[model samples]
Target: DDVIELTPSNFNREVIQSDSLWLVEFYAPWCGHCQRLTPEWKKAATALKDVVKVGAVDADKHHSLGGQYGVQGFPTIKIFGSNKNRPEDYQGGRTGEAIVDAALSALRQLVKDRLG
Candidate 1:
């Protein structure tokens, strides 16, 4: 998986304090919707592998991680656009193509924010 497997142990080090753009999913294993999103998320992860950091949290087991993002649903997608504390919600389509598109746009915005 191109996506990083995030947990409570390493979440802070990997995502919270880093300057990189991150796309994270807070999901539960038992959720069917989460299951269906696996391939799409994987594709997006691979597509954005070198540019952005993509990851997932097992919300059921790592409730603390999900709690930080107020993830009440099984699969809550979020974008950490240089703002590590409060993430922007992913409101785009769930398709891999859409995911990649949005990631790049966010990446572009991030660059502009820093460079300008």
Candidate 2:
């Protein structure tokens, strides 16, 4: 499946409202680092597509979405909906695999916390 194109216009409806684990990458097209992570994010997105809703938000076009999420850096990966009444932040960042793994781990924890 194609990675969902997340923007300020559809963010709330497509991502924030989804019940699944919404994984969003906050990035910019011109940022070399962000560009480099595109393929990896695509791969990770596909790998987790069945279990999560993965997407990318171009900071250049969706500044409001980025600001709403308090994304302070490019390639910021966040997992939403674990704590529905509150906002949570991802605490670690590493290689692409590590990043995805961290997100998945968080998702699992969220599920366990919610159901168990």
Pick the TM-score winner. Answer: 1
TM-score of each: 0.95, 0.84
Model 1: per-residue Cα lDDT over 1-116, one tens digit each: 78899999999999988899999989999999899999999999988878999999999998987887899877899999867887898977888999899899999988987898
lDDT of 2: 0.75
Where's the lowest-lDDT run of ten residues in candidate 2?
85-94
Which candidate has the top score in lDDT? 1
Q: In the order shown, what is each candidate's alpha-carbon RMSD?
A: 1.0, 2.1
Flag clash pairs in model 2.
none
Rate residue 107 of model 1 by lDDT: 96
Off by over 4 Å in 2: 84-87, 91-94
lDDT of each: 0.90, 0.75
